């Protein structure tokens, strides 16, 4: 629903609170949980962990015990960590990052996958899975045939690879934002000097966003076509809806993805275009940033001797009521 989800959330008190220190700690855990091979994490390891993170924020040493326990305690209520009583374990308990926990932590620690060969490769694989499912869908079969050779592949491999492609995009979205910042600071330090580097960072992401969109368009319809063949093989055996609604979302998500792919590009030209205007405006007419610099200092010294700009101001025309 709409305001019903809001009650549900405040009915379960869903919340997340992770100040830098806490987040670092949660992050410190994932880092070690990642290198997991010996088994789960122990209360000993968690504190040993919280201990280093505490030293990182140059604070008291004795309070550790209680804070370490206070911390771990809400990491649990906030549904970020899970606790299990285990005598064998140092501290008599083991902790596991929750799904939510893996989520939040992954974003920060899990390395980012930025490759067109990746996408290409992904699309290929999806193409195969989608072809076979298409053929197999029309070649009919008992119930185990549909649930295993049509539905399943779509649902557990296709729907999965799309969600990844999508994620990669959102990831690519943060790189764009990242390049914008590089360009901002680059310019904020070398002024006219950076003009070269920026255009290169600019030129490079346009090429990237282009290769990606090509790939998606190149496979987009061969793919979309098969989802259709399947969407038809159901026209017949109507009462097989879970396989219809799946083909529907898979189609929507692909459109959703292909759509955005085009839009970002169009959006980048907006930024590019604007970055060129700026240079041509705040840098060219002030090649050594002398004006700008003095204008800033001008803001601090204004009160020592204030002045005001003049402007024409004709008397309005007074009229009756």
């Amino acid at each position: 629903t709409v305001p019903e989800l809001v009650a549900w959330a405040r009915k379960n008190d869903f919340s997340i609170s992770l100040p830098v220190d806490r987040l670092s700690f949660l992050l410190a855990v994932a880092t070690l949980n990642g290198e997991r091979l010996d088994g789960e994490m122990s209360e000993g390891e968690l504190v040993d962990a919280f201990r280093h993170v505490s030293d990182a924020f140059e604070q008291t040493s004795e309070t550790i015990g209680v804070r370490a326990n206070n911390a771990i305690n809400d990491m649990v209520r906030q549904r970020l960590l899970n606790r299990f009583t285990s005598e064998q374990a140092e501290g008599n308990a083991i902790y596991r990052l929750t799904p939510l926990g893996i989520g939040i932590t992954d974003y920060y620690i899990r390395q980012r996958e930025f490759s067109t060969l990746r996408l290409s490769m992904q699309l290929s694989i999806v193409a195969g899975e989608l072809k076979r499912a298409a053929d197999a869908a029309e070649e009919g079969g008992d119930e185990f045939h549909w649930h295993r050779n049509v539905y399943a592949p779509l649902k557990y491999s296709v729907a999965e690879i799309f969600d990844s492609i999508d994620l990669t995009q959102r990831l690519m979205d943060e790189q764009q934002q990242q390049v914008k910042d590089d360009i901002a600071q680059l310019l904020n330090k070398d002024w006219r000097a950076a003009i070269s580097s920026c255009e290169l960072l600019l030129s490079e992401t346009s090429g990237t966003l282009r290769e990606l969109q090509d790939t998606l368009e190149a496979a987009g319809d061969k793919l979309q076509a098969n989802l259709l063949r399947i969407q038809d093989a159901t026209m017949t055996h109507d009462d097989l809806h879970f396989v219809d609604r799946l083909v529907f979302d898979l189609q929507s998500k692909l459109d959703r993805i292909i759509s955005w792919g085009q839009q970002s590009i169009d959006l980048w030209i907006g930024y590019d275009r604007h970055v060129h205007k700026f240079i041509r405006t705040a840098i060219d007419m002030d090649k050594n940033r002398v004006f700008a610099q003095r204008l800033r200092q001008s803001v601090q010294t204004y009160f020592d001797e204030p002045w005001a700009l003049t402007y024409a101001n004709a008397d309005r025309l007074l009229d009756m009521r």
């Binding site: 930024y271 004006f291 800033r296």
Partner: protein, 201 residues
Amino acid sequence: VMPVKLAQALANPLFPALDSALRSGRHIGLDELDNHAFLMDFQEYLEEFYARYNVELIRAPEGFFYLRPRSTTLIPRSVLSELDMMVGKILCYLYLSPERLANEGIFTQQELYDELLTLADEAKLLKLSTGSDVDRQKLQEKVRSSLNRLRRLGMVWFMGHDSSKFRITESVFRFGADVRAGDDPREAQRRLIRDGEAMPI
């Protein structure tokens, strides 16, 4: 009788509205394609026309246009408040700051207000006299109040009357006149006052 091109202009469909805008202190920037293109072609003749009221039609190095009323002006003249000046300056600053390039030209009343308090004695601004919120608010409203006047003057273009977002125009440079020619504040302001560009407070 009259110089040919003086008439071609005064008769052009764009004039009455432009004239009305210019006499009200508006600065005609590049965003106003037609009006700007117009003033560009009849610059000299409209120069003749406005002179007749003791007003200099002026084109700045940045390309915008505005009237600069002389002492013996047939069209009354005014001066921005100290807060106005301050806002205008912040606007000019934001206009030359690369740290905002992601905005693509569209700023917020919030980004403005913060930038102001970031670069100016919050104390002295409140000088329009303590730290009371009944005074704090009065600043944010006055700021907005100033932002709207500069909107009427052409320094800024609101992205919706209701909106709290806006675009900045080249006209904000007038706010940096006291720094165009490297010098001493008391000196520059001496030339700005002599030229009719500025006034004392």
